[model samples]
Target: ALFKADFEDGNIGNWRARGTEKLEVVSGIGHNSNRSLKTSSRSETYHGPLVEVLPYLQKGSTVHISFWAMYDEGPATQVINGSLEKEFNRDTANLEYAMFASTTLNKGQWKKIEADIIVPAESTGISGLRMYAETPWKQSSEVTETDTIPFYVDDVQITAT
Candidate 1:
């Protein structure tokens, strides 16, 4: 069975952006399903969602992750970055090492995505996952509007194979 996690709290647990900046939930309507928890953001070149997997997974395990996402026909970009980290008391601290995989939404349709990553044997411990987005720096540029074309994420899960 796949382990599931939802951004229902309007935040991905306490996982946050790496820097001093933070991501904000634009509105509940942006959620793809369960109208109560849907969210989106402006991510003005800085702010975006970041999260970590809870507990930890065993090293040498093969894992798969999946989620639903979309983007407006605009310049904005949505990215999901994840990594395995050593367990630490501080939630916002950096990991011993990290790796990333990303995708771009060029159209206005919701699509499901899946990725497979190998848990490195030498890492301290599997810690968490992170999700976030960014918009072009031009002040005139804007992300897909949540009003007309809000991106929705639903049924996020991870499985060990």
Candidate 2:
């Protein structure tokens, strides 16, 4: 089966923003897509967009996630994060398994990245998927507000293997 979620659903329950800094959804700010989400320096170190895909995946299955990203020139220290998580219990508080991936956006043209993730066998239920950006080390003196680089993400998809 194929699973997908784009900001096209109206930014309500379809997505969540996290970070020490503030993040906002900006329209007509992306490279290819008509809209893109913007994360500010004040936002938390880690922020994610959560999604439920239990019905589309199995306990011992493999999931392939693909997305496109691009960023402008900025401080060499800025970083962005992404991950997928599986929930195992009814309380929704128990997360059984998770996989994380991250990349730093200093300066460059738009690039596409993809990852193949395996779901732990013991995991029962699957719940949230998230993506985030943050800066932990000394804020790179290279970064600036006017230097605020933009990254465009489009065509995010998940497939079971």
Candidate 3:
């Protein structure tokens, strides 16, 4: 796998926050290590951490992705879903290529999610790996902080075949 992050090195590395989400490496809560990537301050379902994956991908290939994810115990009812978006260089548009995982986190339990992304021949690159908890089909608007939930992820693996 060319794109892998366990947060074991005590750093966030290439993982970056998307939208209003706050991202960082935190200890004491993780699947494989006390160290893990935490994303907070999210106001929308699309808010979370992501990493660039173009260098690791090729045209007409299937990319497999897996990760361990957990979220803080909160009253806000939501589920986590992971997806990969492909970008087209010719039109500068993004396509929601695949939805890999969909699960609920109860009592902050960690769940392993996996998905395979099919790369189109015309696809220039991927937008990145997106891991987020939100209501499906809901419009992305600023939500009150009380309604937002912080989430954690670790052991992310991205490979192509």
Candidate 4:
């Protein structure tokens, strides 16, 4: 495994929330352990938990990312999604974002999301491996600022092929 984080050690490790999302290492709930990383307080579709993976990734190489996700139970319309984004030309005027790998999550049950992604040859580095439980394609103004769509994520692994 090139990268792995189960959050079973009662810590979030290198994981952090993107934007206004909130994250915490909580107990009594997990995919295969007693602890997992939970995220909430999302005001937008893109706000979620993210972790840096550039240190274990290489440009022009392919890697497989896998993780377990479970969104809080609610309406059948409730869902979550995972993605990988890359940033290129960090210090140059040609800065860009390359998005790859997305999977819709299941509600109230552990769902394994796996995807193979190629690190672009022109990529300066990866921005992060991210996940959000917010509904996609909805106007941000339609969401209440205090909406909470908490989700549990654990057993994140990235491996070189």
The TM-score leader among the candidates is 4
Best by lDDT: 3
Q: Tell me, what's the RMSD of every candidate?
A: 6.1, 5.0, 3.2, 3.3
TM-score of each: 0.54, 0.62, 0.80, 0.81
Candidate 2 residue-wise lDDT, 1-161, digit = tens: 36664555436344444434444566765546666555545422233334455455565677877655555545544454446544554556665433355565545544444677765464544344333333322344644443344444545677876
User: Candidate 2: which pairs clash?
Assistant: 19-43, 19-44, 20-42, 20-43, 20-44, 21-42, 21-43, 21-44, 22-43
Q: Decide which is better by lDDT, 1 or 3.
A: 3
Which residue runs of candidate 3 sit more than 4 Å off their true CA positions? Answer: 90-98, 122-137, 141-147
| Window of ten residues with lowest summed lDDT in model 3 | 128-137
Which model, 2 or 4, shows the larger lDDT? 4
lDDT of 1 by residue, 1-161 (tens): 44664555555555455444433443443436442223344334433334465445555677886665555544454443333343433454564544344555556555556678665553544444444333323343553343223244545667887
Clash statistics: count for each candidate = 8, 9, 0, 0
Off by over 4 Å in 2: 8-13, 19-23, 71-74, 91-99, 121-152
lDDT of each: 0.48, 0.50, 0.68, 0.68
Clashing pairs in model 3, backbone N/Cα/C closer than 3 A: none
Sliding window of 10 residues with minimal summed lDDT for model 2: 129-138
Q: Please give the TM-score that candidate 3 achieves against the real structure.
A: 0.80
